[PDB]
From a paper:
LAMPs have been implicated in a multitude of cellular processes, including phagocytosis, autophagy, lipid transport and aging.
The crystal structure of the membrane-proximal domain of human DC-[name] was solved by multi-wavelength anomalous dispersion (MAD) phasing and refined at a resolution of 2.8 Å. Analysis with the protein interfaces, surfaces and assemblies service PISA predicted that the domain is a monomer in solution, in correspondence with gel filtration results. The front β-sheet is bent in the middle by two connected β-bulges, which are formed by the β-strand pairs S2/S10 and S10/S9. The conformation of loop L1 and the adjacent β-hairpin formed by strands S7 and S8 differs between chains A and B, due to crystal contacts, indicating that these regions are flexible in solution.
Numbering used by the authors: 223 to 377
The structure:
């Protein structure tokens, strides 16, 4: 689970800066104790793009098989991840799994600061699809000379 360094821009100004490792867990079997399919987002094989905004942004990460979409909202003061979507193709059998969590308050951080959380974070997107983050340090909206803000933590 290698940590990727991602970035979203408004022409030249920094809109979103995100470092993290991301894993997708799909539950093949109806039995909750049965093994699951793991998929590591490989950062050297993943395209970051996304859309900046005064009150709402998104970091989208695309890879062969699908994507992970992190949507940010700033309430002011403070910003947070307000939505998470994912899409993942498995070759055999031949399934696309996907899911979106719509109304969440996640990694909420005082505006102008950065969020850090090296500890594994987790979110059920659908009933079978789960996303896990690790080694997270990110920041959105307010920036100062392309550096991480006054920092914060989770647990
Ligand atoms: C990513 O999120 C934005 C809203 O923040 C949305 O417009 C876009 O459709 C999403 N992308 C995907 C592929 O889910
Ligand atoms: Ir599903
Ligand atoms: Ir939190």
């Amino acid at each position: 689970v290698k940590t990727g360094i991602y970035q979203v821009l408004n022409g030249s100004r920094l809109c979103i800066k995100a470092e993290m490792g991301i894993q997708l867990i799909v539950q093949d079997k109806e039995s909750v104790f049965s093994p699951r399919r793991y998929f590591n987002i490989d950062p050297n094989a993943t395209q970051a793009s996304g859309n900046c905004g005064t009150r709402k942004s998104n970091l989208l990460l695309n890879f062969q098989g699908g994507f992970v979409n992190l949507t940010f909202t700033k309430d002011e003061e403070s910003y947070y991840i307000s939505e998470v979507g994912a899409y993942l193709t498995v070759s055999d059998p031949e399934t696309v799994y996907q899911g979106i969590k719509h109304a969440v308050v996640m990694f909420q951080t005082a505006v102008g600061h950065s969020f850090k959380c090296v500890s594994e974070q987790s979110l059920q997107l659908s009933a079978h699809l789960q996303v896990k983050t690790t080694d997270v340090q990110l920041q959105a909206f307010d920036f100062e000379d392309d550096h991480f803000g006054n920092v914060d933590e989770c647990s």
